[PDB]
């Protein structure tokens, strides 16, 4: 069952990003805090939509896609990925990682249903690395 | 109005990009027409130094984020 | 039986030569078109009288005579010329080629009667080569610069025109055009070509690249 | 038997390109008109030599080569090309498409002799697409 | 009038030759007197650069066409 | 000191590269840290024309020799 | 047995490179001189370390590697390379060419022991071509004009230098030099070349003619 | 003295040739050395207009009479 | 028997050439007058030596040689020249025309002995034409 | 076996030409010194490439060609040339003199193999005369 993040925590994090900036160690610590439980693509996408401005959000979408593509290359380079399965029918496509696959587009409940925990942690680590890249790039 | 937005002579590029993306996304365009419009407004607005910087891009930039990253990398520090 | 060329086609060709000039590829194509069927000396002479001015016509008469003389030298060097015959009584004199022989002076019907088809095609090829010579003669690449306000396609057109219509060998035009694109073509485009992540090894590729990445203004 | 295009039509088309430009819809309609019957490489080459200036002609040669190469890749990807045959001895090389093969260089009669109708229509479509590309590029 | 034709300071040589041959052939001279007159008008008109170019001709030019060819070959490109 | 080396406004690039490589190799750095330092000093020193020339490199340059070759090819002749 | 090159010759060559530069014909002649006997990778490597600065040495290492890789591609494309053998056990790896193979690293004696004469001459030719590339790279003909006060021999020297030290094919230099003599070389010499009763078909002949008939001033 | 004879700025060429041939033939030179001296004095004296006129002779002039004829033909009428 | 021309007439002709020039019709008439009887090469040579300056005399020697060469070409083109004979032993060489043949060099008496009247009139006409050429050339 | 000239002597001669000029008697003496042994076309060509500037080198190539052509005319005028042989198969073409013949282009060893000593001395004398002409012409 999907539970959304508190809008109070999200508002506090957005104001933190607004006053301290993207690169302050306190901001990265707060992001790591709100990045503790494995989030669904819907959660991370809406979170970055709210806390980041338009141009940093575009940059972050780009960087997140690139990092997810590196993850999928490593996944096709190793059939023992915690997102993959043993047979070929469990291979994870980027539509399933970005939340674009069938039964997931716009629906967080179905998303949480079909996604694997390894998928969730890989998406989360990818999003964190992308946030770091964009923060280092913006300023 | 998005089609009246120009990058001022003294304005930085991230401020211009913020203003333009704001005015384009908060407008009456369909959702599937915002990215091409933002790109083509980056190319024709954004005073001729950045215009030539985007024109002479050895790679093809097909996303506002990629254009912003490229311009921020190769911009004239001043 | 002799049939004259249409004065309508001749008028259109004359106006083409008047507006486009003698050396344009469209003009040479039109001349090749009106040079399709083997013409009698009368036809080619009147055609050049009408389409060419007085001084180009004098030059063309000179060049036509020289080329016909080369043809007659090759003919006396080979008794199997399509204008010649097997015996010595069919040897073709320049009076017969220029239409000056007996029974031909001023009369196109008699001309068409006595002339051979090989004679006609040789006269026609000679006249075409003479026209080419005079056109190349009647009308500098290393002095061409791209003006401050000129576009790049106009500069490329002018440069390629002046380089291909010059005295360079055919195998030296592309490298010269490239190296002139690189050193002329004012420093904005110079730096645009210099910072090319790919290696451009053809004038067409350079033109395409510059047209893609040019500063819209 | 090869029949050349009328120099009157070619002169009218050249003046159309001279006054209206390369990209006007009337110019493209006129080109489509003179591109009605399948032309031999000699015909299209001389046509573009006459109607186009030197630099657009260089660009058009480049684009025509690229499009013909795409056609030959599709041809080696499908042995049922109307230019190809069933056996391997009918495979069509770029020397045969550009008119550079043996018995064709400079001779339009021999060209018309050895070429296939599928070859002719493929060459013609390739030349039309190349003209469109160059027209979109020049202005 | 043929005897009043001069090559202008800015005029090219083929235009001057065209004008002169036109005025000489469309005049009251006998047919056997046109070529010598055209030659001697090329030599005395046709401003002193081309005058000296024709004067210092290592070969003898005995026809208007030959003079035109020689001058077109050795003319000062400008 | 290697970290104080700048390319002068009038200095050529091969002289700057010679001076920088000399000061970096004749210093207290480990041998495995000289190439990355030389590259990152080419990128941040070497006044902004060459900085932008290296930044807009369609290929990725991963060696001081490759950077030197690229810059020598595409440098602004002056 | 390995014999080192004289440090006196190496010092003289280094000072030659220091004063004349990398691209002078005297410098290339001196390098060809010291490149006469087939050198071991150790010799050429130390030679380029001594005569070249740090940045040209890096460039030269790059170019030498690329040329050796082309050589090894040609070697795997032909089993009859003078560096190769007939069986597969004599195939020459780049570690053996660059001196990195086993029993060769840092030891010139062992190097000279295991290397083939074909290997040595291939390495030497590769190093010479790499030196040529780097020299052409370390340091525009269509922009050269004869100054109002400049003499003609200086202009000809500058133009021939810039044309021969450029990217043109070898068969396109003479026509370009001639056509640049004709269109550059301010209008007095332009008219002097134009009114040439003879046809000049060589840069040397044009230079001789102009030097004969030039306006002494 | 023959070696001191120059063609004056206003003097015609036939007067200069007369004076020079007179002074050369009425001197102490051997008879077999007069023609080469007269030729080489025509070439080096005879102020630079005629000097260049003789220099650019498509034919080789090997006699004082031939040089005189050539110069009289192609001289600048003034 | 050879009789020399009067030095009084030669002095008057020289002063005429000195005052009127080479091209005046009175000068040409006077030359035609002193060119009435067929002169020997010695006579014409000395006459031109006296009346002409050094440079016109060189030009006249050249022109006289050229005209005599044309005459000798016409003579070898027709064996019925009044200077020639019927057999090949009477063919007239340029040494006999210019007075350079054997028994003639410097001796006017021997000259008058061996020369033919046709030879004399041909030499005279040649000299007159050469004088005309040089006069037209000098001014 | 071919032995190259010392680059030290060539450098000294080049500096002599640079300071004293082309026409000084000391320079001509030095050239005669380095022109002592019969040189192959490769040697003389590279020597003139190094010691002479670009424009004097062009002039020297022209003059050397002209002098070699005069030599070949004298050779076809006398079958007893030290470069020629007795039969017609040893006649020396300009491709063999300028080093352009087969087996000689760019290879000094093969050059030294096929060339005759008479060929070498004729080439050397021709090059010396050409150097004299160019030196008299340059200044």
Author numbering:
A (entry chain H), D (entry chain C), I (entry chain J), J (entry chain F): 10 to 148
B (entry chain G), E (entry chain A), F (entry chain D), H (entry chain I): 152 to 229
C (entry chain B), G (entry chain E): 10 to 148, 152 to 229
Give passages from the manuscript.
As the virus buds from the cell, the viral protease cleaves Gag into several fragments, including the capsid protein (CA) that then assembles into the mature capsid shell (core), rendering the virus particle infectious. In mature lattices, CANTD interactions form only intra-hexamer and intra-pentamer interfaces, while CACTD interactions are also involved in formation of inter-hexamer and inter-pentamer interfaces. Our results show that, like lentiviruses, RSV is sensitive to IP6 in vitro and in cells, where in the mature CA lattice IP6 binds in a pore formed in the center of the CANTD hexamer.
Most important, we determined the structure of the mature CA pentamer in these polyhedrons to define the interactions between hexameric and pentameric RSV CA assembly states. In order to classify hexamer and/or pentamer (unit) pairs according to their geometrical context, we grouped them using two criteria that we found to influence the geometry of the mature CA lattice: (1) the presence and location of one or more pentamers in the vicinity of a hexamer, and (2) the orientation of a pair of hexamers with respect to the local curvature. According to these criteria all hexamer and/or pentamer pairs were classified into different classes belonging to six general groups. The hexamers that are adjacent to pentamers are deformed to allow bridging of the tube-like areas and the pentamer vertices. Specifically, the two CA monomers facing a pentamer adopt an arrangement similar to those two CA monomers in the pentamer, causing an increased spatial separation between the CANTD’s of the hexamer. State A was found in all dimer interfaces involving pentamers (with higher curvature) and low curvature hexamer–hexamer interfaces, whereas state B was found only in hexamer–hexamer interfaces with high curvature. In contrast to the pliability of the RSV CA hexamer, the CA pentamer represents a rigid building block that acts as the local organization center that defines hexamer shape and, depending on the position on the lattice, overall core architecture.
